């Protein structure tokens, strides 16, 4: 169990020490990493992550990569946490149809960050066998009463109206420039799919 450093299909095992609680009588969390290979431009220098911890945001990943740079004495900067659909909210695109779970893409600013941080995961993967007390503890952000009752709080009227006017102010003008004939061609193709 301790000697498991990398998966058969190349996923680096990443342990985490877990915080104690009043109701609970040393456990570890296992997030698995991989280099992401893609021809997509915004999907470059990403780490494909499986089994993310609870409420993992860009800030806790900047903290953890800051701990990795603090330990193995290297340079790496985190750019953007991509595809964090933790509850299943952005899995199915509804708007394109009316017209990969527990994974993420850890986008870095450059290839030196994913090379240095990838080798830092190569060195961090062996600590389950080498030093079980030198692992990094994952500190969960803990929602209080206020965070759960934020979803009972009302919508802000002014930014909603700003979303209406700035939302329609782009699409109504662009689609107003692309009016009838093009949409009649597209729905003509939709009727072409209707017949056969």
């Amino acid at each position: 169990i301790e000697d498991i450093s990398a998966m058969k299909n190349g996923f680096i095992v990443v342990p985490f020490k877990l915080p104690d609680h009043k109701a609970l009588p040393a456990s570890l969390h296992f997030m698995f990493a991989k280099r992401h290979q893609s021809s997509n431009s915004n999907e470059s220098d990403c780490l494909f992550l499986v089994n993310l911890p609870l409420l993992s945001n860009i800030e806790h990943m900047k903290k953890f990569v800051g701990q990795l740079c603090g330990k193995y004495d290297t340079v790496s900067h985190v750019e953007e946490l991509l595809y964090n659909d933790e509850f299943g909210l952005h899995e199915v695109d509804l708007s394109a149809l009316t017209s990969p779970r527990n994974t993420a893409l850890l986008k870095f600013v450059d290839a030196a960050s994913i090379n240095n941080c990838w080798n830092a995961l190569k060195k961090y993967s062996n600590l389950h066998a080498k030093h079980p007390n030198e692992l990094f503890e994952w500190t969960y952000t803990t929602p209080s009463f206020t965070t759960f009752v934020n979803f009972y709080k009302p919508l802000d009227i002014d930014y909603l109206k700003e979303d209406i006017h700035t939302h329609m102010a782009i699409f109504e003008q662009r689609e107003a420039q692309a009016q009838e004939d093009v949409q009649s061609s597209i729905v003509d193709e939709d009727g072409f799919t209707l017949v056969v």
Partner: protein, 457 residues
């Protein structure tokens, strides 16, 4: 009111409009989850409704902005604000209009158009064969939310005059589901239609002229009925519009066609159909199998308990007492604010506060807690709780409990795949098994101050 689009309909579909709200409606008692009653809102049939669902719901939103502008403009005794509706999957732009009267009651307004079903069935036609049953679930919750609830509250409010004892039986039965933590997975209207069969079909017994006889016929019928082999077909009329022979046999053909593809009933357990729901799956899909077998099993423990020890006070006390048995973990919860007085329950809420953000100061954190815990652990865990903490949360109404069951999908080692949706630990470099304790740290750190006790398996 004067609008650019004339209102076609203002149709109430609330439970308190069909008299099934578990708490009776108390003025200014907003802490109850049945406080805001949903109302369907329909405008005139006009081509001003766009061909994209986000701009459609934002058009509904701006229409509710005009309604709020007139309402705050001239009817300032009525208070109002806006909220989101995310219970429909992947339509995050649904905004409900919450209105608080000086009579102390609150309503949420939602808008239904004719462009809706064209866009949803359009989206089903646009979908490839991969994503189709999830859009069947979104369209199914959409149909259960906007379309047949008008005929449901219409029909039950209609024939409710013929069965006067139906309301305390169905409210007490929903409290029985609340005590046994089965209310969170089961929709309310399904429990109404399960609860209506000894009334709409009293034979060979009589129509129940008491709360005791009705609730005992409910528990007896649940303890005797087999959902696997037998359907449930209802005639929702008044005593001497009934179903013909060909329609009854057609619904039985729907049941047999359902049992051709789901013979063990894992995907669909309860088939409760009628004239209002010929499909029988509108309010009964998405519920786990141990909810069904646990409901039938607790029905057999209750009914066989009354066969064994007779009927006295202690047996009725054991009807409403959670045994808390056969669970993988037990989470003991306590909110720091008791809400039994503010839910309007005698053992007084008189006004709404000046700030609407203070209304969240008298809400249920455990409902959002178990809600998002079901949203994240949908593939890995089965999580049950008490929805109405002011009813069954002690003497102050401030304690909850999360009974958690590991699904049989994640009991052993599995091949590691990227779409596993499980918190695992490796047994080798190839296979992984579920990590219980890391999930337990996520639950405790997710419920940092309210988780008081934690029992394991």
């Amino acid at each position: 009111m004067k609008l650019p689009l004339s209102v076609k309909s203002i149709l109430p579909v609330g439970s308190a409009f069909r008299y099934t709200s578990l708490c009776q409606p108390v003025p200014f008692a907003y802490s109850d989850p049945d406080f805001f009653q949903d109302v369907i809102l329909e405008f005139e049939t006009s081509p001003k409704w766009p061909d994209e669902i986000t701009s459609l719901e934002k058009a509904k939103t701006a229409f509710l902005l005009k309604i709020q502008e007139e309402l705050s403009a001239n009817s300032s005794t009525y208070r109002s604000f806006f909220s989101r509706d995310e219970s429909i999957p992947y339509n995050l732009e649904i905004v409900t209009l919450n209105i608080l009267t000086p009579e102390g009651y609150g309503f949420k307004f939602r808008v239904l158009t004719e462009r809706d079903e064209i866009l949803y069935l359009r989206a089903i036609a646009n979908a490839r064969n991969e994503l189709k049953p999830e859009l069947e679930a979104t369209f199914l919750k959409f149909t259960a939310k906007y379309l047949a609830s008008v005929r449901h509250t219409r029909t039950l409010e209609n024939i409710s005059h013929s069965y006067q004892f139906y309301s305390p039986v169905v409210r007490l039965f929903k409290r029985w589901l609340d005590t046994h933590l089965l209310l969170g997975h089961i929709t309310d209207e399904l429990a109404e239609l399960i609860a209506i069969k000894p009334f709409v079909d009293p034979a060979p017994y009589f129509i129940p002229g008491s709360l005791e006889n009705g609730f005992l016929k409910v528990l007896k019928f649940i303890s005797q009925w087999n959902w696997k082999d037998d359907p449930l077909i209802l005639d929702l009329v008044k005593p001497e519009e009934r179903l013909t022979l060909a329609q009854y046999k057609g619904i039985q053909m729907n049941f047999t066609n359902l049992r051709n593809s789901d013979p063990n009933g894992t995907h669909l357990q309860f088939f409760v159909a009628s004239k209002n729901d010929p499909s029988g799956i509108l309010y009964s899909s998405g519920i786990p199998l141990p909810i069904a077998t646990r409901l039938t099993a607790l029905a057999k423990v209750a009914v066989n308990l009354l066969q064994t020890h007779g009927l006295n006070q202690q047996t009725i006390n054991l009807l409403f007492t959670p045994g808390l048995k056969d669970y993988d973990f037990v989470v003991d919860l306590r909110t720091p604010i008791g809400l039994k007085s503010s839910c309007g329950i005698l053992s007084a809420p008189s006004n709404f506060p000046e700030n609407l953000n203070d209304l969240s100061e008298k809400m249920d954190p455990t409902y959002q807690l178990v809600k998002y815990l079901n949203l994240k652990y949908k593939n890995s865990l089965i999580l049950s709780s008490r929805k109405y903490i002011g009813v069954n949360g002690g003497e102050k109404g401030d304690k909850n409990v999360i009974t958690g069951l590991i699904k049989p999908l994640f009991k052993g080692a599995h091949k590691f795949r990227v779409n596993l949706d499980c918190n695992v630990k490796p047994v080798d470099d190839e296979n992984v098994i579920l990590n219980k304790e890391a999930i337990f740290h996520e639950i405790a750190a997710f419920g940092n101050d309210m988780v008081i006790n934690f029992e394991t398996d």
